Amino acid sequence: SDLGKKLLEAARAGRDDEVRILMANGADVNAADVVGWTPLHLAAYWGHLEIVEVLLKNGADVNAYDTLGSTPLHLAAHFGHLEIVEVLLKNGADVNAKDDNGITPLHLAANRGHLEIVEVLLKYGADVNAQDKFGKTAFDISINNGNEDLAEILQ
Amino acid sequence: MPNFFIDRPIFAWVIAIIIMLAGGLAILKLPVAQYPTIAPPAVTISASYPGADAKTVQDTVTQVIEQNMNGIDNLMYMSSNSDSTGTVQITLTFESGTDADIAQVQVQNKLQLAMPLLPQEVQQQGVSVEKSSSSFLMVVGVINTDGTMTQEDISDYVAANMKDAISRTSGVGDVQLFGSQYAMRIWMNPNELNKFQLTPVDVITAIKAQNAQVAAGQLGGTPPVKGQQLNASIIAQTRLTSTEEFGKILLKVNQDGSRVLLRDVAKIELGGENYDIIAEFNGQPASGLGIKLATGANALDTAAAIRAELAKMEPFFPSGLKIVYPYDTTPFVKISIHEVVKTLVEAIILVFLVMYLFLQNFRATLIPTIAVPVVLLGTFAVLAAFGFSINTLTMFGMVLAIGLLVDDAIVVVENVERVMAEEGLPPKEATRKSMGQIQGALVGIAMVLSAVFVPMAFFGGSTGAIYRQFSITIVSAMALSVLVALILTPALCATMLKPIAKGDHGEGKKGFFGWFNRMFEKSTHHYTDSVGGILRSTGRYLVLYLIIVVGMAYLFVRLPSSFLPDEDQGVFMTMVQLPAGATQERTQKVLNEVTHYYLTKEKNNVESVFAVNGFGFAGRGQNTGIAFVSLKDWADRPGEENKVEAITMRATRAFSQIKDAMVFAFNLPAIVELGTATGFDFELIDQAGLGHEKLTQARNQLLAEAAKHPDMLTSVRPNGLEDTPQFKIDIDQEKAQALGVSINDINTTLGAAWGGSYVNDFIDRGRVKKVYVMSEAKYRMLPDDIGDWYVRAADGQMVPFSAFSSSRWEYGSPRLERYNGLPSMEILGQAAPGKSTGEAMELMEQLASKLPTGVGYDWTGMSYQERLSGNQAPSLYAISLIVVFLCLAALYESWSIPFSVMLVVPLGVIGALLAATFRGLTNDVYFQVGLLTTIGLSAKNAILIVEFAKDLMDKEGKGLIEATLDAVRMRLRPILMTSLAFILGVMPLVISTGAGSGAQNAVGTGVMGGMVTATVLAIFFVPVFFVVVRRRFS
Amino acid sequence: PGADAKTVQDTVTQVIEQNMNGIDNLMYMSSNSDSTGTVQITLTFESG
Amino acid sequence: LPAGATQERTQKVLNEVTHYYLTKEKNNVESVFAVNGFGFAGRGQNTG
């Protein structure tokens, strides 16, 4: 789609006003680039909260996955976008989604030490014993990283 | 001095002869080039890191080198880019006047001492340090027409059999190969490697062992056993030389005894060193040579020598190989010289005709015909002495000086003719009296013109270098003109002119000349009558003068300013930019469409399209390309419709339809050594370790704000590349250690297969060339291919990459920029219509002051150049105005009479501005220098009117009005003679529409219009100036 | 070290000589490559 | 000396050269400084 590509670009660039116009004209909210990222992926990666909300109001797939199994919740949790994590979960994001590596949003939040996001994820039922392809849990990550605060939250 | 040489005509001839011989010698020795060196000296450091991403390059190469660029003299600034093709370029730009050799050796020496700090792979590739220059003399293309050779085949042939002989050709300063010589390519197969429990590590180890030079020693070497009868070198292992030998490299001997050879796990071929560029010439595989002219060389002789050498090579070319010349400046340069020599000859003919029309004897017509060539020849001698070249700028400088030179000849001879006709004196006595009337003014004129033009040589930077070419050329010609007017032409007048009877003004002649003389004598009385009436009512004309001044200023402010006019140089470019992540094959499809358009819809104008996939000035990569369009000769492209600007406009609109690609055509700048030099060049700087993402955010903030001022800023855009998706793979150290797999085997296996690895060198038909291992294409295309690569653990088991790695998509930069050692982002833009670049720069600085903490900025390139040149202009104008006034004050022994001359300035300028505006030209360098020569010649006209009038008042006691009327009466004929000759002489430049007509138009239009109004207005306004000024100051 | 004259001419002397172009005032260039691995390239420049 | 010749053979020739200057030209030659293994063609054993 022509407008699908302009929406991918506007969602990445945080151009709220342009996304508004594009939603009116019916730009494909399920458009995806060569790596499988939707506008929701891009808005979650770059932290554009308002655009994440507009996209979800316009029928975007909250649990879309890229060619390696990663969802917008993975990206928002990994890069510390707390408000986006909450919005995604309120709109049905899979809190225990596993990418091709077995890595969950909790793994990624723990790895970067995003304590608030870890608690939001756990509040929404994140599986604290989930293991990735190497057998590691969010707790293993906190011990290896030496994050004592995080290790106490993961009991 | 005139009286000295009037009595010594042989001495005067001797001086003329010496001048002509020096000039003849200079014409033979003088370098010839399209343009001289203009840009400040720049040195570029270039390095390659095969398989490296932009951040790896930046953080292991670029930062290290930058941190060592200390203790170098005369550095203005430093800039760099590190990109995802594994390349870094660092450019150090030095003050104008810096010795470029010293700058480069100082850079090279600091680099040498940083080499131990760089990665081994980069030390192996090496790091080149070169003087930067965008000026090519020509580009020789090499193509294969019978489809028997790839571009790699062609590049190797050029490297092995052409490049060196071209580099040795007379006048060639540098030769750059568009491609590489062959490399031995080992294309690995992961399935076969795993079948035999081998990895790229084993391949590399075997190649290094079995393709090597091994030192041995000597038989009977010293110290020997006495009685030894023979001494001979021992030759041991030497480098391999063929694909056959590489395939037989032994990798493993199996238990059953069977042998695993390199050809059992890899395809082996001679290929290119890299595959990022695909070059096509009208759809056919191509390579080529970019040739630069050597310092002091003759561009015309060098091009001829290059062609002669290529002819000698022709009998040895393989079948299908053809030479093409998609870019060659020397045809243009040859036309320029021809056109300029034409202008000077025609100018001398026109003076001959005007001299005969008015003076009606051939003996007088011969005196300028001698004097003007002598002056021009002497000017070449001075040019040589100053170390200048014959180039576009110096040549047009002499054209712009023609009026001044022609005028010195007309003025000297015409005045003697008048004196003879008005007093009946013999030629010798007449020349003595005539020179006594004008010699002081000629000297004052020389000083005044020097005050006008010399300060123009003291602008700094690139614009100053351009202005200096015109300044030295014009001042030199003007200075020789006055010397010749004081030495030679008086001697020629006294010895060559025939007497004229007192009162004889030719009115008694018959036929055309008798009628002409009566007509002109009557017209002179009509002229002096009009000036009488003008002088009876001066206040009205002072009002009209202020009107002219206001109209000048108004027309000046509205006249768009540029540097040098675009030219139909027979070539232009087409940018092809596809979305991020677009692959090479996709770019190739677009380039094919582009090539197909020019060869179909523009087949009567286009000779060739040189399509280069993978190269882009804004950044390299698979998603970018250029199409260099070479046109047929101007003689086959008649009319504006078939010129670059029209072709370009048509192409750009035609390509607007292309989907998922930005494709547009544009003309080249006049001076390719410089960029467009239009707009501004801004650097956003990370001053506090903010990092790439925060800098991008700050950039976007600035770009968005700039977009809110379309009235002031236009096309404010980043010059670099946007972040793109990249494949992040994490190796799990614990899992690697648990399985007994070393990290070095993992990273070598990954890098060698997917990025490629330069192993060592081999010798191909007597030439040393590189050996590269890399995965065959089909095993390194997609993430699923990662898991097909196995690494052998310590216990012998083969372990797939999937077992000890994980991956995810992320964004990163394909091109990281730095400025003076700090992260940066370059931003280009231009002032909106009607606004000055200075005003646009002011706003940019205001917007930049509101960016987040830690973000700074700087001006670079043209913008750095414009700020410094602008800071000098006020003081250079002041010095010119002050010195002009002082010279006139000394000439006239008066603090006030100078004003009557200096008031002439607007009279020429108004007509130059009118002609430029009407014709739709710009306030460019040729227009500006022409304004100075028009002002100069009008000031000369006024100087002689005022001189005559003042001398009549001082010596003959005549009244103010009486002397003014007698002065303008006497000066009418010579003023009209020069103006008629000079205006007709520049006419061909105005109407020219051929090659180089952009510069010819810019020289002629302003000069012709300025000469028209300067002539018409000055003969009426100068008497007003003198009368009004004398009345005010008694 | 250890390289013969032909090897050192192909891997050193010719590589250097190929880059000795476009030097100002160069009159001629002479070189030898010998069996000790030694290379000497001498560039002679115009008077002055 | 020819290809392959040794330092010892070169010394025999240098002895004959030195001998000539020290006997036949002893009225004209003050000194001879002769070097085996160094000459206009290199440092081979067959040069002096």
Ligand SMILES: CCCCCCCCCCCCO[C@@H]1O[C@H](CO)[C@@H](O[C@H]2O[C@H](CO)[C@@H](O)[C@H](O)[C@H]2O)[C@H](O)[C@H]1O
């Ligand atoms: C007007 C009075 C004064 C007389 C002198 C005015 C003109 C003097 C400057 C003219 C330029 C001299 O420059 C000279 O140009 C000629 C003609 O293009 C070139 O002559 C030749 O150059 C090459 C070599 O074959 C070819 O392009 C061609 O055969 C020809 O152009 C010389 O190589 C160059 O040195």
Ligand SMILES: CCCCCCCCCCCCO[C@@H]1O[C@H](CO)[C@@H](O[C@H]2O[C@H](CO)[C@@H](O)[C@H](O)[C@H]2O)[C@H](O)[C@H]1O
């Ligand atoms: C808007 C662009 C204008 C560009 C052109 C301007 C320059 C052209 C100058 C033309 C000069 C000739 O114009 C000249 O004008 C003056 C008035 O000033 C006339 O002079 C007339 O008026 C004056 C004053 O009232 C009387 O003293 C005089 O006896 C009478 O003849 C001249 O007879 C005429 O010859």
Ligand SMILES: CCCCCCCCCCCCO[C@@H]1O[C@H](CO)[C@@H](O[C@H]2O[C@H](CO)[C@@H](O)[C@H](O)[C@H]2O)[C@H](O)[C@H]1O
């Ligand atoms: C014989 C006739 C010909 C003779 C005329 C040739 C004279 C040569 C002129 C030399 C020019 C000197 O060059 C000029 O030097 C002055 C000295 O303050 C500098 O000075 C300038 O600096 C800055 C500019 O913002 C100001 O603070 C200062 O007021 C201004 O003068 C100029 O930037 C430089 O352009």
Ligand SMILES: CCCCCCCCCC(=O)OC[C@H](CO)OC(=O)CCCCCCCCC
């Ligand atoms: C109305 C004013 C006209 C100015 C036109 C100047 C265009 C050339 C600009 C340029 O290149 O600058 C060079 C140089 C700077 O010193 O220019 C000048 O010096 C221009 C001033 C010279 C004229 C004053 C003398 C009066 C005549 C007898």
Ligand SMILES: CCCCCCCCCC[N+](C)(C)[O-]
């Ligand atoms: C530096 C001053 C330049 C002005 C030149 C003045 C020359 C006037 C000479 C007058 N004269 C001696 C001939 O009577």
Ligand SMILES: CCCCCCCCCCCC
């Ligand atoms: C007859 C010689 C006239 C040359 C004028 C020289 C002007 C000096 C400029 C200095 C270069 C920056």
Ligand SMILES: CCCCCCCCCCCC
């Ligand atoms: C360019 C600077 C010139 C300043 C000198 C003015 C001359 C004074 C006029 C009155 C003198 C009688």
Ligand SMILES: CCCCCCCCCC
């Ligand atoms: C090359 C110029 C020759 C000049 C001839 C001299 C004419 C006679 C002067 C008295």
Ligand SMILES: CCCCCCCC
């Ligand atoms: C710098 C010019 C000075 C001239 C002034 C003279 C006025 C009497």
Ligand SMILES: CCCCCC
């Ligand atoms: C009056 C002396 C002039 C001589 C110049 C060469």
Ligand SMILES: CCCCCC
């Ligand atoms: C005519 C004198 C030239 C001035 C050069 C500085």
Ligand SMILES: CCCCCC
């Ligand atoms: C240019 C200033 C002088 C004018 C006299 C009225």
